[PDB]
CSV table of C-alpha atoms and ligand atoms in Angstrom, one decimal:
chain,number,residue,atom,x,y,z
E,73,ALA,CA,123.0,108.3,133.0
E,74,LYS,CA,121.9,105.1,134.2
E,75,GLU,CA,119.4,103.7,130.9
E,76,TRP,CA,120.3,100.4,132.3
E,77,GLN,CA,118.4,99.6,136.3
E,78,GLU,CA,118.5,96.3,138.1
E,79,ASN,CA,115.9,94.9,139.3
E,80,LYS,CA,116.0,91.9,141.8
E,81,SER,CA,112.6,91.6,142.1
E,82,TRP,CA,112.1,89.5,138.5
E,83,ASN,CA,114.6,87.5,140.4
E,84,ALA,CA,111.5,85.0,141.6
E,85,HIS,CA,110.6,84.7,138.2
E,86,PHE,CA,113.3,82.8,138.0
E,87,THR,CA,113.8,80.9,141.6
E,88,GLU,CA,110.0,79.3,141.0
E,89,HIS,CA,110.2,77.7,138.1
E,90,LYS,CA,113.5,76.5,139.2
E,91,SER,CA,115.9,78.0,136.7
E,92,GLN,CA,118.6,80.7,135.8
E,93,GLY,CA,118.3,82.9,133.2
E,94,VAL,CA,117.7,86.3,132.5
E,95,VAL,CA,115.4,89.6,130.8
E,96,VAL,CA,116.0,92.5,129.4
E,97,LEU,CA,113.0,94.9,128.8
E,98,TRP,CA,113.2,98.7,127.0
E,99,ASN,CA,111.1,101.2,127.7
E,100,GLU,CA,110.9,102.6,123.7
E,101,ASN,CA,109.9,105.7,125.2
E,102,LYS,CA,111.5,106.9,128.1
E,103,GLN,CA,114.8,105.3,126.2
E,104,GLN,CA,115.2,103.2,130.0
E,105,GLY,CA,116.5,99.3,129.9
E,106,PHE,CA,115.5,97.6,133.5
E,107,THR,CA,117.3,93.4,134.6
E,108,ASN,CA,117.2,91.3,137.1
E,109,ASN,CA,120.7,90.7,136.1
E,110,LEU,CA,123.1,93.1,134.6
E,111,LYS,CA,126.0,91.6,133.7
E,112,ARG,CA,123.9,88.3,132.2
E,113,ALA,CA,122.4,91.3,130.5
E,114,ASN,CA,125.6,91.5,128.7
E,115,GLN,CA,126.7,87.8,128.5
E,116,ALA,CA,127.0,87.1,124.4
E,117,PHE,CA,125.6,83.5,123.3
E,118,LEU,CA,125.0,81.2,120.2
E,119,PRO,CA,122.0,82.7,119.4
E,120,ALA,CA,120.5,80.1,117.6
E,121,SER,CA,116.1,80.1,116.8
E,122,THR,CA,117.0,83.9,117.1
E,123,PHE,CA,119.1,84.2,114.4
E,124,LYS,CA,116.1,83.2,112.1
E,125,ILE,CA,115.2,87.1,112.2
E,126,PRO,CA,118.6,88.1,110.9
E,127,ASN,CA,118.6,85.3,108.3
E,128,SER,CA,115.7,86.5,106.6
E,129,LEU,CA,116.8,89.3,106.5
E,130,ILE,CA,119.4,89.3,104.6
E,131,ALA,CA,118.5,87.1,101.9
E,132,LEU,CA,114.9,89.2,101.5
E,133,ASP,CA,116.6,92.1,100.7
E,134,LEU,CA,119.5,89.8,98.4
E,135,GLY,CA,116.2,88.6,96.2
E,136,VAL,CA,117.2,85.0,97.9
E,137,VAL,CA,113.5,85.4,98.6
E,138,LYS,CA,111.2,86.6,96.5
E,139,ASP,CA,108.5,87.9,99.3
E,140,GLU,CA,106.6,86.5,101.5
E,141,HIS,CA,104.5,83.7,99.6
E,142,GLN,CA,107.1,82.3,97.5
E,143,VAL,CA,107.6,78.3,97.7
E,144,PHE,CA,110.4,76.1,99.3
E,145,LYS,CA,110.0,72.6,98.2
E,146,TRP,CA,109.8,70.0,100.9
E,147,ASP,CA,113.4,67.8,100.2
E,148,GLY,CA,111.3,65.3,100.9
E,149,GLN,CA,112.8,64.0,103.4
E,150,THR,CA,111.7,62.6,106.9
E,151,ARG,CA,112.5,64.7,109.6
E,152,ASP,CA,111.1,64.3,114.0
E,153,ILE,CA,108.8,67.4,112.9
E,154,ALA,CA,105.8,66.5,111.6
E,155,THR,CA,105.2,70.1,110.3
E,156,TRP,CA,108.7,70.5,108.7
E,157,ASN,CA,108.1,67.7,106.5
E,158,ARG,CA,105.7,70.2,104.3
E,159,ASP,CA,106.6,72.9,101.4
E,160,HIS,CA,106.6,76.5,103.2
E,161,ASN,CA,106.8,80.1,102.4
E,162,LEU,CA,108.8,83.1,105.3
E,163,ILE,CA,105.8,83.0,107.1
E,164,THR,CA,105.3,79.3,107.7
E,165,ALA,CA,108.8,78.4,108.0
E,166,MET,CA,109.1,81.0,110.7
E,167,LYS,CA,105.6,79.7,112.5
E,168,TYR,CA,107.3,76.1,112.3
E,169,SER,CA,110.6,77.7,112.9
E,170,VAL,CA,112.2,75.0,109.5
E,171,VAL,CA,115.8,75.3,110.4
E,172,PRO,CA,116.2,73.4,106.4
E,173,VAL,CA,114.2,76.0,105.2
E,174,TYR,CA,116.6,78.3,106.5
E,175,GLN,CA,119.8,76.5,105.5
E,176,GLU,CA,119.1,76.1,102.4
E,177,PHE,CA,118.6,80.7,102.4
E,178,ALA,CA,122.3,80.3,104.9
E,179,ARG,CA,123.8,78.6,101.8
E,180,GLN,CA,122.7,80.9,99.0
E,181,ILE,CA,123.2,84.2,101.0
E,182,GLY,CA,126.7,81.9,101.2
E,183,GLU,CA,129.5,82.9,103.1
E,184,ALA,CA,131.1,86.2,102.1
E,185,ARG,CA,127.4,87.6,101.7
E,186,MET,CA,126.9,86.6,105.3
E,187,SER,CA,129.6,87.8,107.3
E,188,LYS,CA,129.3,92.3,105.2
E,189,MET,CA,126.2,91.8,106.1
E,190,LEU,CA,125.9,91.2,109.4
E,191,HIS,CA,129.0,93.9,109.8
E,192,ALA,CA,126.2,96.0,108.4
E,193,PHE,CA,123.7,95.3,111.0
E,194,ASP,CA,126.6,95.2,113.8
E,195,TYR,CA,125.9,91.8,114.9
E,196,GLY,CA,127.1,90.7,118.4
E,197,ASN,CA,130.5,89.1,117.6
E,198,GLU,CA,130.5,89.1,113.7
E,199,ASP,CA,131.8,86.3,113.8
E,200,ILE,CA,130.3,83.0,112.0
E,201,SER,CA,133.2,80.1,111.7
E,202,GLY,CA,131.6,77.1,111.2
E,203,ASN,CA,129.5,75.5,108.1
E,204,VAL,CA,127.8,78.3,106.0
E,205,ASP,CA,124.1,77.0,107.0
E,206,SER,CA,124.6,76.7,110.7
E,207,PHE,CA,126.8,78.7,113.1
E,208,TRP,CA,124.1,80.2,114.1
E,209,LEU,CA,123.3,76.8,116.2
E,210,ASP,CA,127.2,75.5,115.8
E,211,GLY,CA,129.3,77.6,115.3
E,212,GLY,CA,131.5,81.1,116.2
E,213,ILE,CA,128.3,83.6,116.6
E,214,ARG,CA,127.6,85.1,120.0
E,215,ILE,CA,125.4,87.7,120.8
E,216,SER,CA,124.2,89.2,123.8
E,217,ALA,CA,120.1,90.3,125.4
E,218,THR,CA,121.5,93.7,125.3
E,219,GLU,CA,122.4,93.4,121.5
E,220,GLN,CA,120.0,91.6,121.6
E,221,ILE,CA,117.3,95.1,122.3
E,222,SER,CA,119.5,96.8,120.0
E,223,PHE,CA,119.7,95.1,117.1
E,224,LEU,CA,115.5,94.5,117.4
E,225,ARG,CA,115.3,98.7,117.9
E,226,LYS,CA,116.6,99.3,114.5
E,227,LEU,CA,114.6,96.5,112.8
E,228,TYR,CA,111.5,98.2,115.0
E,229,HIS,CA,112.5,101.4,113.0
E,230,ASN,CA,114.0,100.8,109.8
E,231,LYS,CA,117.4,101.4,110.6
E,232,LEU,CA,118.8,98.3,109.6
E,233,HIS,CA,121.4,98.1,106.3
E,234,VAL,CA,119.1,97.1,104.6
E,235,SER,CA,115.9,97.8,102.1
E,236,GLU,CA,112.7,99.4,104.4
E,237,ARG,CA,110.5,96.6,102.0
E,238,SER,CA,112.8,94.0,103.4
E,239,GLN,CA,112.4,94.4,107.8
E,240,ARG,CA,108.0,95.4,107.3
E,241,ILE,CA,108.4,91.0,105.9
E,242,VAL,CA,110.1,90.5,108.8
E,243,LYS,CA,108.3,92.1,110.8
E,244,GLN,CA,104.8,91.3,109.4
E,245,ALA,CA,106.7,87.0,109.8
E,246,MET,CA,107.3,88.0,113.3
E,247,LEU,CA,103.5,88.6,114.6
E,248,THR,CA,102.8,86.4,117.0
E,249,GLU,CA,99.7,87.0,118.8
E,250,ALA,CA,97.4,90.7,118.8
E,251,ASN,CA,94.6,91.1,120.7
E,252,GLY,CA,92.3,94.6,120.8
E,253,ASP,CA,94.9,95.6,123.9
E,254,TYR,CA,98.7,94.3,121.9
E,255,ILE,CA,100.1,92.9,119.0
E,256,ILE,CA,103.6,90.6,120.1
E,257,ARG,CA,106.5,90.3,117.7
E,258,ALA,CA,108.7,87.8,118.1
E,259,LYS,CA,108.8,83.8,116.8
E,260,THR,CA,111.9,83.2,117.8
E,261,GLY,CA,112.9,80.6,120.5
E,262,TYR,CA,111.9,77.6,119.3
E,263,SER,CA,115.1,74.7,120.0
E,264,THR,CA,115.9,72.5,117.4
E,265,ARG,CA,119.0,70.8,118.7
E,266,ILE,CA,120.8,70.2,122.9
E,267,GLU,CA,122.2,74.3,123.2
E,268,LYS,CA,123.7,75.7,126.8
E,269,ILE,CA,120.8,78.2,126.6
E,270,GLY,CA,117.7,79.1,125.8
E,271,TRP,CA,115.6,82.5,124.3
E,272,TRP,CA,112.5,84.6,124.2
E,273,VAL,CA,113.5,88.1,121.6
E,274,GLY,CA,110.7,90.2,120.2
E,275,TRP,CA,108.9,93.0,121.5
E,276,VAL,CA,105.3,93.5,122.4
E,277,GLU,CA,103.1,96.8,120.9
E,278,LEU,CA,100.7,99.0,122.9
E,279,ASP,CA,98.4,101.6,121.7
E,280,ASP,CA,101.2,104.8,122.4
E,281,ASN,CA,104.4,102.7,123.4
E,282,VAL,CA,107.1,99.8,122.7
E,283,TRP,CA,108.5,97.3,125.4
E,284,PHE,CA,111.3,95.6,123.5
E,285,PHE,CA,112.3,92.6,125.4
E,286,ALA,CA,114.8,89.1,125.3
E,287,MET,CA,115.2,87.0,127.9
E,288,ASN,CA,118.1,83.8,127.8
E,289,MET,CA,117.9,80.9,130.0
E,290,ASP,CA,120.4,77.7,131.0
E,291,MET,CA,119.0,74.3,130.6
E,292,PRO,CA,117.0,72.8,133.2
E,293,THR,CA,115.6,69.8,133.6
E,294,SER,CA,112.8,69.6,131.2
E,295,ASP,CA,111.1,72.2,131.0
E,296,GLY,CA,111.6,74.7,126.9
E,297,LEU,CA,110.1,78.0,124.8
E,298,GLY,CA,106.6,77.5,126.8
E,299,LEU,CA,108.6,78.4,130.4
E,300,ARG,CA,111.0,80.6,128.8
E,301,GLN,CA,107.9,82.7,127.9
E,302,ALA,CA,105.2,82.1,130.3
E,303,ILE,CA,108.7,83.8,132.8
E,304,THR,CA,108.8,86.7,130.4
E,305,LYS,CA,104.9,87.6,130.3
E,306,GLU,CA,105.5,87.0,134.7
E,307,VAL,CA,107.6,90.2,134.0
E,308,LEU,CA,105.6,91.9,131.5
E,309,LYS,CA,102.1,91.5,133.5
E,310,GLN,CA,104.3,92.5,137.1
E,311,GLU,CA,105.0,95.9,135.5
E,312,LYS,CA,101.9,96.2,134.1
E,313,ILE,CA,102.8,96.5,130.0
E,314,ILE,CA,99.9,93.6,129.9
E,315,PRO,CA,97.3,92.8,131.6
E,316,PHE,CA,96.1,89.5,133.7
P,19,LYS,CA,80.1,76.2,90.5
P,20,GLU,CA,81.9,80.3,91.0
P,21,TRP,CA,79.2,81.4,93.5
P,22,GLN,CA,76.7,79.8,96.1
P,23,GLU,CA,73.9,80.8,97.8
P,24,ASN,CA,73.7,78.6,101.5
P,25,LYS,CA,71.0,80.2,103.3
P,26,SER,CA,71.8,77.6,106.1
P,27,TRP,CA,73.8,80.6,107.1
P,28,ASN,CA,69.5,82.9,107.4
P,29,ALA,CA,69.8,80.8,111.4
P,30,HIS,CA,72.9,82.6,111.9
P,31,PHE,CA,71.5,85.8,111.3
P,32,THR,CA,67.5,84.7,112.6
P,33,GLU,CA,68.9,84.4,116.2
P,34,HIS,CA,71.0,87.1,117.1
P,35,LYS,CA,66.9,88.5,115.8
P,36,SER,CA,68.9,90.5,112.9
P,37,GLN,CA,68.8,91.1,108.9
P,38,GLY,CA,72.0,90.8,106.4
P,39,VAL,CA,73.9,88.7,104.0
P,40,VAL,CA,77.7,87.5,104.6
P,41,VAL,CA,80.5,87.4,101.8
P,42,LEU,CA,82.8,84.9,101.6
P,43,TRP,CA,85.4,84.5,99.3
P,44,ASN,CA,88.2,80.8,99.2
P,45,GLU,CA,91.1,82.6,97.6
P,46,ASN,CA,92.6,79.3,96.4
P,47,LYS,CA,89.4,77.6,95.3
P,48,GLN,CA,88.5,81.3,93.3
P,49,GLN,CA,84.8,80.2,94.8
P,50,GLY,CA,82.3,82.6,96.4
P,51,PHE,CA,80.2,81.6,99.3
P,52,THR,CA,77.0,84.2,100.3
P,53,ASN,CA,73.7,83.6,102.2
P,54,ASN,CA,71.8,85.9,99.9
P,55,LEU,CA,73.1,86.5,96.4
P,56,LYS,CA,71.1,89.3,96.1
P,57,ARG,CA,72.3,91.4,99.2
P,58,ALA,CA,75.7,90.4,98.5
P,59,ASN,CA,75.0,93.0,95.3
P,60,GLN,CA,73.4,95.2,96.7
P,61,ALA,CA,75.1,98.8,97.5
P,62,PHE,CA,75.5,100.6,100.9
P,63,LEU,CA,77.6,103.5,102.1
P,64,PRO,CA,80.8,102.3,103.1
P,65,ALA,CA,80.7,104.4,106.3
P,66,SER,CA,83.7,102.4,108.9
P,67,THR,CA,85.7,100.4,105.7
P,68,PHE,CA,86.2,103.5,103.4
P,69,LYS,CA,89.6,103.9,106.3
P,70,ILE,CA,91.3,101.2,104.2
P,71,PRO,CA,91.1,103.0,100.4
P,72,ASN,CA,91.4,107.2,102.6
P,73,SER,CA,94.6,105.3,105.2
P,74,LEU,CA,95.8,104.1,101.1
P,75,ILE,CA,96.1,107.5,99.5
P,76,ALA,CA,97.2,109.5,102.3
P,77,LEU,CA,100.1,107.4,102.2
P,78,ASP,CA,100.2,107.2,98.7
P,79,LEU,CA,100.0,110.9,98.6
P,80,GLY,CA,102.4,111.5,101.1
P,81,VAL,CA,100.7,113.0,103.1
P,82,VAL,CA,100.5,111.0,106.4
P,83,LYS,CA,104.4,109.3,106.1
P,84,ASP,CA,104.3,106.5,108.1
P,85,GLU,CA,102.5,104.3,110.2
P,86,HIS,CA,104.0,106.1,113.7
P,87,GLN,CA,103.7,110.3,112.1
P,88,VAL,CA,101.3,111.6,115.3
P,89,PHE,CA,98.5,112.8,114.9
P,90,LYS,CA,98.2,115.5,118.2
P,91,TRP,CA,95.1,115.9,119.7
P,92,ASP,CA,93.5,119.3,119.0
P,93,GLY,CA,92.7,119.7,122.7
P,94,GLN,CA,88.6,120.4,121.2
P,95,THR,CA,86.5,117.8,123.4
P,96,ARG,CA,84.7,115.0,121.5
P,97,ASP,CA,81.7,112.4,122.8
P,98,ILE,CA,84.0,109.3,121.9
P,99,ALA,CA,87.4,109.3,125.1
P,100,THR,CA,89.3,107.2,122.5
P,101,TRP,CA,89.3,110.4,120.3
P,102,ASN,CA,90.7,113.6,122.6
P,103,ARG,CA,94.4,112.6,123.0
P,104,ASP,CA,97.7,112.2,120.3
P,105,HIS,CA,96.5,108.9,117.4
P,106,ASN,CA,99.1,107.5,114.5
P,107,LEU,CA,97.4,105.3,111.0
P,108,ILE,CA,97.2,102.5,113.7
P,109,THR,CA,94.6,103.5,116.7
P,110,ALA,CA,93.3,106.2,114.9
P,111,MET,CA,91.8,102.7,112.4
P,112,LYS,CA,91.4,100.8,115.9
P,113,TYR,CA,90.1,103.1,117.0
P,114,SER,CA,87.3,104.5,114.2
P,115,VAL,CA,89.0,108.3,114.8
P,116,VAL,CA,86.7,110.2,112.0
P,117,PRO,CA,88.5,113.6,112.3
P,118,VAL,CA,91.9,111.9,112.1
P,119,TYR,CA,90.2,110.4,108.7
P,120,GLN,CA,88.2,114.2,107.8
P,121,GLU,CA,92.1,115.8,107.3
P,122,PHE,CA,93.6,112.9,105.1
P,123,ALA,CA,90.5,113.8,103.4
P,124,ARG,CA,90.6,117.2,103.8
P,125,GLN,CA,95.2,116.8,102.1
P,126,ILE,CA,93.8,114.6,99.5
P,127,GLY,CA,90.9,117.0,98.0
P,128,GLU,CA,88.2,116.2,96.0
P,129,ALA,CA,90.0,115.8,92.8
P,130,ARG,CA,92.3,112.9,93.3
P,131,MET,CA,90.1,111.9,96.1
P,132,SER,CA,87.8,111.0,92.4
P,133,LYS,CA,91.0,109.8,90.6
P,134,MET,CA,92.0,107.5,93.2
P,135,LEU,CA,88.6,106.4,93.1
P,136,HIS,CA,88.4,105.2,90.3
P,137,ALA,CA,92.2,104.0,89.8
P,138,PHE,CA,90.9,101.5,92.8
P,139,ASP,CA,87.9,100.4,90.6
P,140,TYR,CA,86.0,101.6,94.1
P,141,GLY,CA,82.6,100.8,94.3
P,142,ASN,CA,81.1,103.1,92.6
P,143,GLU,CA,83.7,105.9,92.5
P,144,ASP,CA,81.4,108.9,93.0
P,145,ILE,CA,82.6,111.0,96.2
P,146,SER,CA,79.4,114.2,96.0
P,147,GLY,CA,78.7,115.7,98.4
P,148,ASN,CA,81.4,116.9,101.0
P,149,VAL,CA,85.1,115.8,100.2
P,150,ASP,CA,85.6,115.7,104.5
P,151,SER,CA,82.0,113.5,105.1
P,152,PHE,CA,80.8,112.1,101.4
P,153,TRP,CA,81.5,108.4,102.9
P,154,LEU,CA,79.4,109.0,105.4
P,155,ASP,CA,76.4,111.2,104.0
P,156,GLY,CA,77.1,111.6,100.4
P,157,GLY,CA,76.8,109.4,97.5
P,158,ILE,CA,79.6,106.8,97.3
P,159,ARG,CA,78.3,103.0,98.1
P,160,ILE,CA,80.1,100.0,97.3
P,161,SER,CA,78.4,96.3,97.4
P,162,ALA,CA,79.9,92.9,99.7
P,163,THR,CA,81.2,91.6,97.2
P,164,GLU,CA,82.5,95.0,95.8
P,165,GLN,CA,84.4,94.6,98.6
P,166,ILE,CA,85.7,91.0,98.3
P,167,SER,CA,87.2,92.0,94.5
P,168,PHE,CA,88.8,95.4,96.3
P,169,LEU,CA,90.5,93.2,99.4
P,170,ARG,CA,91.5,90.8,97.2
P,171,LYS,CA,93.3,93.5,95.1
P,172,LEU,CA,95.1,94.5,98.3
P,173,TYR,CA,96.2,91.5,99.9
P,174,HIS,CA,97.8,90.9,96.5
P,175,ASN,CA,99.3,94.8,96.3
P,176,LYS,CA,97.3,94.8,92.6
P,177,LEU,CA,96.6,98.2,94.1
P,178,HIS,CA,97.7,101.0,92.2
P,179,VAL,CA,99.3,102.6,94.8
P,180,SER,CA,102.6,101.9,95.6
P,181,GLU,CA,103.6,97.8,97.8
P,182,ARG,CA,104.6,99.9,100.5
P,183,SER,CA,101.1,102.1,101.2
P,184,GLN,CA,99.6,98.2,100.7
P,185,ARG,CA,101.6,96.3,103.2
P,186,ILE,CA,101.3,99.8,105.6
P,187,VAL,CA,98.2,99.5,105.8
P,188,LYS,CA,97.3,95.6,105.8
P,189,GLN,CA,99.9,95.9,108.9
P,190,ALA,CA,97.1,98.3,110.1
P,191,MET,CA,94.2,96.6,109.7
P,192,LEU,CA,95.9,93.8,112.0
P,193,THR,CA,93.2,93.4,114.1
P,194,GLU,CA,93.5,89.3,115.7
P,195,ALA,CA,96.2,86.8,115.4
P,196,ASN,CA,96.8,83.4,117.4
P,197,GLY,CA,98.4,80.1,116.4
P,198,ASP,CA,95.5,79.1,114.3
P,199,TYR,CA,94.8,82.2,112.1
P,200,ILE,CA,95.2,85.8,111.9
P,201,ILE,CA,92.2,88.8,110.8
P,202,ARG,CA,92.4,91.9,108.9
P,203,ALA,CA,90.2,94.2,108.9
P,204,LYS,CA,89.2,97.1,111.9
P,205,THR,CA,87.1,97.7,109.3
P,206,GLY,CA,83.6,97.8,111.8
P,207,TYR,CA,83.7,100.2,114.3
P,208,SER,CA,81.5,102.8,114.2
P,209,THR,CA,80.3,105.5,116.0
P,210,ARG,CA,78.4,108.0,114.3
P,211,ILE,CA,74.5,106.5,113.5
P,212,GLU,CA,73.7,104.2,110.0
P,213,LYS,CA,71.0,102.1,108.3
P,214,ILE,CA,73.8,99.0,107.7
P,215,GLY,CA,76.4,97.9,109.4
P,216,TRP,CA,79.4,96.6,108.3
P,217,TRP,CA,82.3,94.2,109.3
P,218,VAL,CA,85.0,93.8,106.0
P,219,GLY,CA,89.2,91.9,105.7
P,220,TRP,CA,90.4,88.7,104.9
P,221,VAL,CA,91.0,85.4,107.7
P,222,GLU,CA,95.5,84.2,106.7
P,223,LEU,CA,95.2,80.2,107.5
P,224,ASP,CA,98.9,78.8,106.5
P,225,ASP,CA,97.9,77.5,103.1
P,226,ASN,CA,95.0,79.5,102.6
P,227,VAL,CA,92.9,83.1,102.4
P,228,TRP,CA,89.1,83.6,103.4
P,229,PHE,CA,88.4,86.5,102.7
P,230,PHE,CA,84.7,88.0,103.8
P,231,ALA,CA,82.7,90.7,104.1
P,232,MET,CA,79.1,91.3,106.1
P,233,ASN,CA,76.3,93.4,106.3
P,234,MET,CA,73.5,94.3,108.0
P,235,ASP,CA,70.1,96.5,108.9
P,236,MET,CA,70.9,98.2,112.5
P,237,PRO,CA,68.6,98.7,115.4
P,238,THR,CA,70.1,100.2,118.4
P,239,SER,CA,73.4,99.0,120.2
P,240,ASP,CA,77.2,98.8,119.7
P,241,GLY,CA,76.7,96.7,117.0
P,242,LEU,CA,80.5,95.7,115.8
P,243,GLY,CA,80.2,92.8,118.7
P,244,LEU,CA,76.8,90.9,117.1
P,245,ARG,CA,78.1,91.3,113.8
P,246,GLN,CA,81.8,89.9,114.6
P,247,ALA,CA,79.6,87.0,116.1
P,248,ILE,CA,77.2,86.3,113.1
P,249,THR,CA,80.5,86.6,110.6
P,250,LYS,CA,83.0,83.8,113.8
P,251,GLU,CA,79.6,81.5,113.8
P,252,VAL,CA,79.4,81.3,109.3
P,253,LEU,CA,83.1,80.8,109.4
P,254,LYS,CA,83.3,78.2,112.0
P,255,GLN,CA,80.1,76.1,110.3
P,256,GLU,CA,82.5,75.8,107.3
P,257,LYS,CA,85.4,74.7,109.3
P,258,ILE,CA,87.6,78.2,107.9
P,259,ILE,CA,89.0,78.8,112.1
P,260,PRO,CA,88.0,76.1,115.1
P,261,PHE,CA,85.3,76.9,117.5
I,637,LIG,CL1,101.7,92.4,110.6
């Protein structure tokens, strides 16, 4: 039984944009996965921006974040992203990938509780070597695209070892697009520093099905998140998951 | 001033050969605005807007386990194509699947429905009529300003039901989201002939929430698109959402 099928025709979406990477899709109803590259789908990388999901979940479950309205005041330090130089709540911190807010969450969670929770989540290699407030950006943690799918499916089903409340709040914060045809929950691909790999992970909710996606790509000459989203959407449109 | 009348919004009703009221509430400033102070307080049958309290009560009482629970199609062909299939709470709200809400109301029953509407301080709290149709042809009445009060409690998880039930219904209400705003509504799609059509909900911005409740007299055709257009023309005029 092959729960993972390879479709090399999606490689054209990478080659036409002079890029190299993987797209992994999971059809929830059919319990079947699809990818352009099975080997790369299983290669583990630094989670970087995708770590906002487990970080926020742990912060809510432990009461570091009381609710999605609690204000995290700006520290007064001027940074190069204008949207970071203001107060935020969980929703806006996710919207604008406000790394200083997530660093504050990680410091409050602390090393021991962060490690215990990643082990409880079965999250990637569960290795958090590095500064407690930067290990997902320059430390020892690694996760593959197929492991991102397994983690996101548990989140979708409220099956992670954290409160149902924390899972519902994080899914609300992940909201990125909604129209009369579909909803996309993601808010995970923004790159805040130089990394070898960029990501885009999340899911597409349809009336009678959910399609999980996890993609990663090598750093190209100039393109980034916009391109990662474009290639993923080109694949979703090819598979008739979302309309053209 | 707490309440202000803005008659310039009447241009949006006149341009579309319509009559009605738009009520807006600025959460941060605790201030309300309307084109018609009298009509803002006039109470009407809630019709499609009743899916919000009906869903909340059904979830809190365990009639609906969660937003994924499947309500299987009974195999009976109905005259709204989207009703002739299985549904969950999300899609039943999306397609205003009256037979699903009727089954919720029959399970809730008269006594619990009345007690919960009293607990919610919902409109006139009068459920006179058939338990499975009173929000469509019975005694219940609610005004646009009362819709705002009810929605504000829901937004703040302040209704006398679990926080879980409130979070699930707010998820079901999701209708639009982009990089600028989120609209939670799913309350205006009507399949049954009524004297009044509605559109109620709210717009979430980065640092504020604007609640809205509008109603209009009905001539003919699929009025939802028109109700949404008038409301959005008002939101755009007040610079709440971009042009
Ligand atoms: Cl949502």
